[PDB]
Amino acid sequence: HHWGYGKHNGPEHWHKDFPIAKGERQSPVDIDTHTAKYDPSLKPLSVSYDQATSLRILNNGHAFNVEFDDSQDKAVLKGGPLDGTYRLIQFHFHWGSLDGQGSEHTVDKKKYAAELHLVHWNTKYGDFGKAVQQPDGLAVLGIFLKVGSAKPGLQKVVDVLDSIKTKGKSADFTNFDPRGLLPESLDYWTYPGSLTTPPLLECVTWIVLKEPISVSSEQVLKFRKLNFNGEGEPEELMVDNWRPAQPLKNRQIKASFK
Ligand SMILES: COC(=O)c1cc(S(N)(=O)=O)c(Cl)cc1S(=O)(=O)c1ccccc1
Ligand code: NA
Ligand code: NA
Ligand code: NA
Ligand code: NA
Ligand SMILES: [Zn+2]
Numbered sequence: 001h002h003w004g005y006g007k008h009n010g011p012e013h014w015h016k017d018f019p020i021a022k023g024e025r026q027s028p029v030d031i032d033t034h035t036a037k038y039d040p041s042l043k044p045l046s047v048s049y050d051q052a053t054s055l056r057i058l059n060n061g062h063a064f065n066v067e068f069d070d071s072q073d074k075a076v077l078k079g080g081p082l083d084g085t086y087r088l089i090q091f092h093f094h095w096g097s098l099d100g101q102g103s104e105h106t107v108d109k110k111k112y113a114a115e116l117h118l119v120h121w122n123t124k125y126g127d128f129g130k131a132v133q134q135p136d137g138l139a140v141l142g143i144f145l146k147v148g149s150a151k152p153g154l155q156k157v158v159d160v161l162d163s164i165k166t167k168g169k170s171a172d173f174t175n176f177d178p179r180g181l182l183p184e185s186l187d188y189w190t191y192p193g194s195l196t197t198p199p200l201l202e203c204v205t206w207i208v209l210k211e212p213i214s215v216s217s218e219q220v221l222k223f224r225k226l227n228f229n230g231e232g233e234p235e236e237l238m239v240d241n242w243r244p245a246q247p248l249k250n251r252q253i254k255a256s257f258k
Contacts (some may be wrong), residue, residue, distance in 0.1 A: 003198045010175055025202045026246035027106035027193030029207055029252055035195065036064045036189055045186045045207060046079035047141070048181075052088060054176035055232070057160055060238045062197060063092040063241055063251035065177060066075040066157065070121070076176075080207050081190040081231070081254065086120035086139040089192065091178060093117070094196070095223050097239035098120045102195050106209050106240045111142035112161055113220055114180060115242070117196075135192070137203040138253045142218045143183065143213055150216035151178015166231040183211035187257040196243045205230055 003009055003017065015021035052075035058065045065091045068075055075088035095114035096102030103112035118141040121131035131137030156176055163171045187210045196203045226238035 005241050010046065014200065018198045019199045020194070020202060023200070024249050025192050025195065025251065026196055026200065026241060027196050027204060027206060028106070028245055029191065029193065029248050029251075029253070030106045030109060030245040031189050031208065033108055033255075035252040036255045038258045039256070040177055042081055042254060042256045043079045043191070045077070045141075045188060045256070047182065047186065049074065049075050049088070049177070049179045052178055054173050054178075056170050057157070057164055057173040059164040059167055059226060059238075061230075062165060062236070063146060064161070064226065065090045065092045066173060066178075073111075075143060076123075077118075077207075080139075080188065080256070082139055082207075084136070085123045087119050087123055088118060088178070091116060091128075093120045093145070093223065094242040095145070095220060095239065097219070097224065097237075098221055100221070102173055102242055103144055103238070104245075105142060105144070105206075107144075108244050113147050114145035114215070114223070116143040116145060116213075117141070118143075118178065118181075121197065130163075132195075132201050132203045134203055136205060137168040138195075139205045141206060142206060142208040144209070145215050145220070146212045147217050147220055148214040149218055151181070151213050153177070154215055154219055158219050161226060165225070166227045166229060166233075170228055175248055178207065181213065183209055183213050185209070185211040187211065189253050189255055189256075191251050191253045193251075 050139040053069040
């Protein structure tokens with residue numbers, strides 16, 4: 001009886017295996033744009049993805065991960081609110097059963113169709129497993145998706161999904177360039193938070209871009225053909241794999257802009 005996204009094992013249940021679910025810096029949150037304060041001390045974010053090496057794509061039963069080779073200094077995030085270099089290890093998405101839901105963060109209570117998370121770990125901690133044990137171990141760049149015009153740089157991802165339909169399938173996925181997933185503007189909100197999935201560790205500096213990217217209806221429909229079940233089990237479509245907004249508690253959301 002493992003965690004997932006259903007009434008019997010969804011977000012409202014996670015606290016029994018992971019009591020940090022009711023902690024003081026949980027994610028996601030609603031971003032109240034009128035209360036977020038512009039912080040003129042915040043730096044432009046530096047996203048350096050020119051030498052990113054993707055390796056594989058995996059259906060992990062919750063989402064799908066596009067994995068990167070993080071064994072050298074390639075694909076780093078720095079600047080912004082960060083005081084260190086963070087290396088890209090994977091990205092994944094969260095999305096809905098319909099276009100009106102699917103993001104984890106919300107903006108003045110608005111839900112986007114999906115949310116992309118580019119996960120990076122602080123190189124000062126030597127690898128990912130040590131980083132997640134540190135309050136400044138991870139930096140996640142979060143990008144909202146709305147449905148409209150297709151995102152050409154997403155189609156290679158969307159066309160491999162039929163090969164990883166079910167939990168535990170993986171496929172080779174080399175040469176994927178995550179720069180094709182970024183919006184024009186790097187204006188962002190930032191706040192201290194957590195993983196949005198078990199084990200819910202409070203190790204993440206969140207950096208949420210204001211500008212969504214557009215994907216087509218056909219692209220997001222292919223995400224919703226994935227399955228949470230494994231091969232040979234009754235189909236459970238992989239949809240609504242998002243955790244709702246959590247209490248902001250004693251935190252300030254800072255804006256890089258306005
Ligand atoms: C199962 O975990 C995930 O799905 C997940 C999700 C996030 S998210 N959704 O906060 O970006 C991050 Cl940062 C990182 C991860 S994760 O890197 O997959 C992970 C898994 C086990 C322990 C610690 C971290
Ligand atoms: Na404001
Ligand atoms: Na290496
Ligand atoms: Na690692
Ligand atoms: Na709440
Ligand atoms: Zn995520």
